[PDB]
Amino acid sequence: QGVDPPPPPGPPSFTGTKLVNDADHPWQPLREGDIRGPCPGLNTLASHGYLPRDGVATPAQIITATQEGFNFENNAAIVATYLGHLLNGNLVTDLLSIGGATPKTGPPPPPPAHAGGLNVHGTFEGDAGMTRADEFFGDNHSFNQTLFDKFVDFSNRYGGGFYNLTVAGELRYSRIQDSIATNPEFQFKNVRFITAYGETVFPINLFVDGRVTTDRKLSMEDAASIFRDMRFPDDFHRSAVPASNEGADQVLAAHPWVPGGNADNQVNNYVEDPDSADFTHLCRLYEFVVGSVQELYPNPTGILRRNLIKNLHYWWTGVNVAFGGCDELFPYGQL
Ligand SMILES: *[C@@H]1O[C@H](CO)[C@@H](O[C@@H]2O[C@H](CO)[C@@H](O[C@@H]3O[C@H](CO[C@H]4O[C@H](CO[C@H]5O[C@H](CO)[C@@H](O)[C@H](O)[C@@H]5O)[C@@H](O)[C@H](O[C@H]5O[C@H](CO)[C@@H](O)[C@H](O)[C@@H]5O)[C@@H]4O)[C@@H](O)[C@H](O[C@H]4O[C@H](CO)[C@@H](O)[C@H](O)[C@@H]4O)[C@@H]3O)[C@H](O)[C@H]2NC(C)=O)[C@H](O)[C@H]1NC(C)=O
Ligand SMILES: *[C@@H]1O[C@H](CO)[C@@H](O[C@@H]2O[C@H](CO)[C@@H](O[C@@H]3O[C@H](CO[C@H]4O[C@H](CO)[C@@H](O)[C@H](O)[C@@H]4O)[C@@H](O)[C@H](O[C@H]4O[C@H](CO)[C@@H](O)[C@H](O)[C@@H]4O)[C@@H]3O)[C@H](O)[C@H]2NC(C)=O)[C@H](O)[C@H]1NC(C)=O
Ligand code: HEM
Ligand SMILES: CCCCCCCCCCCC(=O)O
Ligand SMILES: [Mg+2]
């Protein structure tokens, strides 16, 4: 009949480094029905049992898992999780797939809402990823060895054989160029424009062992373990502090870029979108997403309406802090 969704967890009581690849959280292979998707962080958490091993979880579980497993900062966890949930989760059962569609999220929502999981392309998941191919090429969720080979190449060329912030700057730009040249449906706007810079530093801030204090750099062995195998490095210790997108500004600065996309179903035809969110116009992202939610849920009532209102408020609490203040929207009024 429905769940009453609780407010998000706050930061963990203990925020220092610790062993996260421990005896209680062993890597285990996929079973039938287990879901994995485009996020190596969530994938690894599920394969080590920080999340349900089937890859279906509540927002609350996802937040706590990203904190426990990686020391993902609380507000960043809230912004990412409720974004994912609002667009791609089942608001009634309070369950989100970290990958594709599954009966495990429960009775489907009214169309055009889908609860189809983080795999759904075009509003959250998008193009020019590091180890995943653009949806246009037919698979936006699987690890892609050719792309990981480029990751290794760029690490060799710019990072001494390791992934560091210099490499991030170069790889991000190059991957944008690849999509311009090869993908006629390439989009790099709104949510994707913002998340694409954060994701390039997460390997440095979160996949590098927390006992490394200076010269933070990720080995290709550790990268492959997480990105491909969904496995923590042996004896992996999380970041010694809550962290998220530190250094993403410098990635952009290395190759200034403007939100937009290839126009008119043609390659090498990138047109700027002046209405898109960008890093000095973050609240546009809030407004865009609320708009998208209204398209998914044009006239909700009952538990669905209630759970939408709550989840929108939950998300806003994170957005308000992370974006430095946005006016809360109330598309369905109040409870
Ligand atoms: C990601 O990982 C990558 C890979 O590890 C990493 O890249 C390293 O980046 C650092 C910088 O961040 C590199 O170090 C810098 O190198 C600068 C350039 O070095 C060249 O030029 C030096 C200066 O040249 C002057 O003097 C010569 C005459 O000697 C003259 O011709 C020039 O015109 C100019 O006037 C030169 O000394 C240097 O040569 C020495 O070193 C090389 C080896 O690199 C050696 O072969 C030579 O025999 C000689 O010993 C070289 O040709 C350098 O300028 C810069 O120095 C700054 O810091 C010093 C203090 O240490 C200051 O005194 C100085 O004023 C500068 O401000 C610095 O050392 C490093 O070499 C990279 N490593 C690799 C593997 O490429 C990224 O940093 C990582 N990214 C992140 C964010 O972590
Ligand atoms: C893993 O990920 C990679 C990268 O996303 C995928 O490989 C790409 O596959 C696409 C589709 O097959 C390739 O697209 C085609 O590229 C041509 C240009 O290629 C050259 O130039 C690029 C850089 O500019 C190099 O990376 C590449 O090595 C080549 O030297 C274009 O000419 C093609 O355009 C035609 O098709 C499009 C789409 O219909 C039309 O819009 C055009 O008008 C035109 O008719 C085309 O876009 C792409 O080159 C591949 N890249 C690489 C690096 O291989 C893998 O498929 C993916 N999968 C796995 C499992 O590996
Ligand atoms: C907190 C909730 C999280 C959500 C909802 C989430 C969601 C996503 C999604 C949808 C993508 C694909 C983006 C795209 O294709 O445009 C992605 C990619 C990524 N996520 Fe997560 N993520 C979360 C937490 C984390 C954490 C904690 C980490 C690291 C510890 C992480 C690291 C990454 C990285 C590195 C990528 C990029 C993979 C690539 O480009 O190859 N995420 N995430
Ligand atoms: C100052 C930058 C604020 C960053 C807002 C990012 C919005 C959602 C983040 C999702 C990150 C991820 O892919 O895990
Ligand atoms: Mg993608």
For residues 9 and 16, the answer to whether their CB atoms sit within 8 Å is: no
Nearest-atom number in ligand 4 for the CA of 244 is 11
Nearest CA to ligand 2 atom 15: 182
Token pair, residue 185, equals 């449906």
User: How far is Cα 47 from Cα 118, in angstroms, rounded to an integer?
Assistant: 17
Cα of 244 vs its chain's centroid, Å? 11
Nearest CA to ligand 1 atom 1: 159
User: How far is Cα 192 from Cα 201, in angstroms, rounded to an integer?
Assistant: 15
Method of determination is X-ray
Burial 127-147, CB ≥16 within 10 A → b, else e:
bbbbbbbbbbeeebbebbeeb
What is the CATH superfamily name and number for domain 40-322? Chloroperoxidase-like (1.10.489.10)
Ligand nearest to the CA of 78: 3
Q: Is 311 in the pocket of ligand 4 (CB under 6 A)?
A: no
Q: Is 319 in the pocket of ligand 4 (CB under 6 A)?
A: no
**Overall residue count recorded for the chain in this entry:** 335
Number of H helices and E strands in the chain, helices first, is 10, 5
- Is residue 121 helix, strand or coil? strand
User: How far is Cα 177 from Cα 186, in angstroms, rounded to an integer?
Assistant: 10
Mutational test site, ligand 1, from 164, 208, 217, max ligand atoms within 8 Å of CB: 164
Pairing of strands 56-57, 270-272: unpaired
Nearest-atom number in ligand 1 for the CA of 164 is 1
Q: How far is the CA of 145 from the centre of ligand 2 (A)?
A: 14
